[PDB]
Design a protein around this motif. Structure first.
Motif, PDB file in Angstrom:
ATOM      1  N   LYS B   6       0.851  -1.176   0.000  1.00 49.69           N
ATOM      2  CA  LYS B   6       0.000   0.000   0.000  1.00 49.69           C
ATOM      3  C   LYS B   6       0.889   1.230   0.000  1.00 49.69           C
ATOM      4  O   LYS B   6       1.852   1.293   0.764  1.00 49.69           O
ATOM      5  CB  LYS B   6      -0.905   0.011   1.229  1.00 49.69           C
ATOM      6  N   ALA B  99       3.504  -1.052   3.850  1.00 51.51           N
ATOM      7  CA  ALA B  99       2.953   0.270   3.609  1.00 51.51           C
ATOM      8  C   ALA B  99       4.088   1.265   3.452  1.00 51.51           C
ATOM      9  O   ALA B  99       5.040   1.266   4.239  1.00 51.51           O
ATOM     10  CB  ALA B  99       2.010   0.697   4.732  1.00 51.51           C
ATOM     11  N   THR B 110       6.512   0.609   6.660  1.00 48.23           N
ATOM     12  CA  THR B 110       6.184  -0.189   7.830  1.00 48.23           C
ATOM     13  C   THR B 110       5.583  -1.500   7.349  1.00 48.23           C
ATOM     14  O   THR B 110       5.059  -1.605   6.242  1.00 48.23           O
ATOM     15  CB  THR B 110       5.321   0.544   8.908  1.00 48.23           C
TER      16      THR B 110
ATOM     17  N   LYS C   6      -6.908   5.077  12.179  1.00 48.41           N
ATOM     18  CA  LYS C   6      -6.218   3.800  12.128  1.00 48.41           C
ATOM     19  C   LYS C   6      -4.884   3.953  12.835  1.00 48.41           C
ATOM     20  O   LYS C   6      -4.172   4.930  12.603  1.00 48.41           O
ATOM     21  CB  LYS C   6      -5.995   3.365  10.682  1.00 48.41           C
ATOM     22  N   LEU C   8      -1.245   1.988  14.071  1.00 46.15           N
ATOM     23  CA  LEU C   8      -0.321   0.891  13.816  1.00 46.15           C
ATOM     24  C   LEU C   8       0.845   0.971  14.792  1.00 46.15           C
ATOM     25  O   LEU C   8       1.238   2.059  15.237  1.00 46.15           O
ATOM     26  CB  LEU C   8       0.223   0.948  12.383  1.00 46.15           C
ATOM     27  N   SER C 108       4.184   9.160  13.914  1.00 46.73           N
ATOM     28  CA  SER C 108       3.877   9.894  12.715  1.00 46.73           C
ATOM     29  C   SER C 108       2.399   9.773  12.450  1.00 46.73           C
ATOM     30  O   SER C 108       1.719   8.827  12.881  1.00 46.73           O
ATOM     31  CB  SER C 108       4.654   9.339  11.545  1.00 46.73           C
TER      32      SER C 108
END
Ligand SMILES: Cc1ccc(C(=O)c2cc(O)c(O)c([N+](=O)[O-])c2)cc1
Ligand SMILES: Cc1ccc(C(=O)c2cc(O)c(O)c([N+](=O)[O-])c2)cc1
Lengths: 116, 116, 116, 116
Positions: B6, B99, B110, C6, C8, C108
Motif C-alpha cells: 500500500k 505500507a 512499515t 487507524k 499501527l 507519525s
C-alpha cells in the motif's frame, strides 16, 4: 563533509550507535562500485565518508545495516537493511545528510540537501 | 493475499495511484530474481502479487518506483526508488502488508504482519 | 464513515489494538468540546465516530492514548498522547482517514482525504 | 541547552526555517503555563529555550506552527500545528531534542533524549 549519515532509534529515543553504513556509486557499466563505509558514532552520525572532489555527480546507494543493530539488542526486525538510492550533484555540488529513524518493523529516511 | 503493498502520498494526502511495484526473491547466487509486479489501484494498493503456495520462506525485495510517481506529478524527487527488503515466513506463513508513505525527499515504510 | 482513525504499532508490526481515541470540536470560546470516542478494533481501526450530517466544517482534534498502549505492553513511552488537529471540510465534505504509526519515542500521522 | 527543537521539510529536503515554536509547562492547577518560545534558525533548529535550572520536572508541551510554514509556501496543509506533550526529567535532568519532519498532509516527530 559532503555526505553524512545519521541514524536514530525510535524505541529508546537515542542515537543508533555502532551501525554499519556502506556507500556505493553506480559505475559506467551499471554495477555498484564500493565507495565508502563506516559506522555511526556515539551521536549516531557517520562522518568522513568522502571529500568534495571525490564526490562527483553520480547515482549513489547508502546501505545501513539495521538488522545487525536490532539483533544485538535481542530483536529480530522486519527489514534486512535500510537502503537509500539517489542522484547526487546533478545541479552542482551539494551537502547531503541522509537520516534514518529506526523501529523494529518500520523505518523512515529523509534527505537534507544544502548548498555550501 | 499473503503479500499486499500500500502506497500513500504525504503531499496530496491521498493514496498514491498508478505506482509501479516489483517484487523479487533472493536467488541462491545472491542475485535478485523477479517474482511479481503491478501498479497500485485507486486505493493505493497492489493486491494479488503472490499465493500461499508460492510465497515460501526467503528474502524478498519490493521496489517501488517513487521517482516516476513524483515526475508524473511535476515534483522534484530525491530518491531513485524506494526498496523494502525483508525475510518472509521465518516463523511460519504470515500475511504481510508493506505500507509506504511517500514525500519528495523522504519516505517511510512499515510492515503490518498478521498470522492467519 | 466520514472520519476513520487507524493506529499501527511499529515495534510489533501490527495494528495497535484497544487504543482509546477521543475526538473534539473547537468551540466558539476556543475550548475543546468532546465529540466522539472509541477503542481501536483488531485491525487498529476506529470506525463509526461520526456521520455526514454531524461532521460539519470546523477544527477537530483527535487524541490517541498512546501512553496507555505502551504501558499495557510494558514498554517505556516518551509522549503523554498523540494529538492530531485539523480543519475539516473547508472545501466541501471529505472522507478522512487519520493514520498514526506509533513507536515508543516517535510517532507519525498522515491524512488520507478522499472526495466521495 | 536542555531542550532543542529541530524542524525539517520533507518536500524540499531542507531545514524548515522561521517556524514558530511555543513551549508550555503544566501548572499545579492543570493549566498550560507559557514557558518559552522562539523560531527556527536557518539550520531548522530552535536553541536557547531554557536552562537546566529552570527546566524542572514536569509535563511540557511543544507546539510547532506548521500551518503558517506551509501557508507562506502557498500550501493549505492538513494539520493546524504539530504538538508534542511529554513528561521531562522524571529520572533526573536530561537533554531533549524534539525533531519534526513535515509534509503537507503528514508529520512525524521523534525525541532524542540523552544524559549529560
Ligand atoms: C504515518 C503512517 C505511516 C504508515 C502507516 C501504515 O503503515 C498504514 C497501514 C495500513 O494498513 C493502512 O491502511 C494505512 N492507511 O490506510 O493509511 C496506513 C500509517 C501511518
Ligand atoms: C521524525 C524525524 C525523522 C527524521 C528527521 C531528520 O531527518 C533529522 C535530521 C537531522 O539532521 C537531525 O539532526 C535529526 N535529529 O537530530 O533529530 C533528525 C527528523 C525527524
Amino acid at each position: 563533509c559532503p555526505l553524512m549519515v545519521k541514524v536514530l532509534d525510535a524505541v529508546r529515543g537515542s542515537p543508533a550507535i555502532n551501525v554499519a553504513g556502506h556507500v556505493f556509486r553506480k559505475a559506467a557499466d551499471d554495477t555498484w562500485e564500493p565507495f565508502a563505509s563506516g559506522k555511526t558514532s556515539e551521536s549516531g552520525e557517520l562522518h568522513g565518508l568522502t571529500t568534495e572532489e571525490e564526490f562527483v555527480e553520480g547515482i549513489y546507494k547508502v546501505e545501513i545495516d539495521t538488522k545487525s543493530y536490532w539483533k544485538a539488542l535481542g530483536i529480530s526486525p522486519f527489514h534486512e537493511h535500510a537502503e537509500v538510492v539517489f542522484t547526487a550533484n546533478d545541479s552542482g555540488p551539494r551537502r547531503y545528510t541522509i537520516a534514518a529513524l529506526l523501529s523494529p518493523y518500520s523505518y523512515s529516511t529523509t534527505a537534507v540537501v544544502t548548498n555550501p
